[PDB]
Design a binder for these strands. Structure first.
Ligand code: NA
Ligand code: NA
Length: 327
DNA sequence: CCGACGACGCATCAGC
DNA sequence: GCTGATGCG
DNA sequence: GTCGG
């Protein structure tokens, strides 16, 4: 549905969501508003009243009332007020820095630190993650065109294979589903020597190599199984440099790899459905394993999984291409 | 009425 | 110093 | 804030 249909309503609900998360620290209200915004955004009719919207799942009495106020007046008094509230709008803004969450944003604003300029003047008050989030503030808010994601994938797969040709690497997320753009890069990594029953350095050796070839530029966090950092494609001598991009790399045991690839490929709606179907078939699926459920509901040992298809076969579902996992 | 609403890796804090 | 809690994503 | 046991 065109954004002109209910974009006013959905924009209002998304703004209310952000204030719940970042200012009121009410995460379940943030998700309530997002859920409302999503079901309205997919509604293929320009809404005429709150009662109409309340028929939708996730829209209740309070949001119906707000929609009535918005349709009648073109705005929402409470949103107008918080928008111009210097403290609340500054707290909400600062959480756009990666590493600054609601608690840090509140603490900063409490001591007069309200803008990117104020953060730049107060480096010693920022931790390592927050300094990187500030350094790449604008780059991190840009989307990644699919052509750049392919070039990024070219580098990851080549360097991974270079370290050890027995590594297996898969770039998941919307990109694997075919998306024309991405917000970041999610790489899932495994190695036949790493199973749930049985090296460190498996992840470090890959991160190191990507740093040696100057693809990974910064690290946000790094442990034995999860890396979160920054990468950047090489710029042709003489062309504008590519923005810096967020990349995550996860090391997963081989016997849990394809469960992980399935989960992190998504979509979220699709996983909810598959997990719903799996239950009504006698199986429980999480990001790690698929396990059978006994007649009293006791989950048994995880079942062998050697491919994505294996998971579909267990639950009597035809294999769906990532391209067809929108829901 | 009133609890669920995602679990978890990593960085860093709070407490001992 | 070690252990658990909290923040963040 | 919404849903539902
Ligand atoms: Na409803
Ligand atoms: Na943030």
């Amino acid at each position: 549905p065109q954004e002109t249909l209910n974009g006013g309503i959905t924009d209002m609900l998304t703004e209310l969501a952000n204030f719940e998360k970042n200012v009121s620290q009410a995460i379940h209200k943030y998700n309530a508003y997002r859920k409302a915004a999503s079901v309205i955004a997919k509604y293929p009719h320009k809404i005429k009243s709150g009662a109409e919207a309340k028929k939708l799942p996730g829209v209740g009495t309070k949001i119906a009332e707000k929609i009535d106020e918005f349709l009648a007046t073109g705005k929402l008094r409470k949103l107008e007020k918080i928008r111009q509230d210097d403290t609340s709008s500054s707290i909400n803004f600062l959480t756009r820095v990666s590493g600054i969450g609601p608690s840090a944003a509140r603490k900063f604003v409490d001591e007069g630190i309200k803008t990117l300029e104020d953060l730049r003047k107060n480096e010693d008050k920022l931790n390592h993650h927050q300094r990187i989030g500030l350094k790449y503030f604008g780059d991190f808010e840009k989307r990644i065109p699919r052509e750049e994601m392919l070039q990024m994938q070219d580098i990851v797969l080549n360097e991974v294979k270079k370290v050890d040709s027995e590594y297996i690497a898969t770039v998941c997320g919307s990109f694997r589903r075919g998306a024309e753009s991405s917000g970041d890069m999610d790489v899932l990594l495994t190695h036949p020597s790493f199973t749930s029953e049985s090296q460190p350095k498996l992840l470090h050796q890959v991160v190191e190599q990507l740093q040696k070839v100057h693809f990974i530029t910064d690290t946000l966090s790094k442990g034995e199984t999860k890396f979160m950092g920054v990468c950047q494609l090489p710029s042709k001598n003489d062309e504008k440099e590519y923005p810096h991009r967020r990349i995550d790399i996860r090391l997963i045991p081989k016997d849990q790899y394809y469960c992980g690839v399935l989960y992190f490929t998504g979509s979220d709606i699709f996983n909810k459905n598959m997990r719903a179907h799996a239950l009504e078939k006698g199986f429980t699926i999480n990001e790690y394993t698929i396990r059978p459920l006994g007649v009293t509901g006791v989950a048994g040992e995880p079942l062998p999984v050697d491919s994505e298809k294996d998971i579909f076969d267990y639950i009597q579902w035809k294999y769906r291409e990532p391209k067809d996992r929108s829901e």
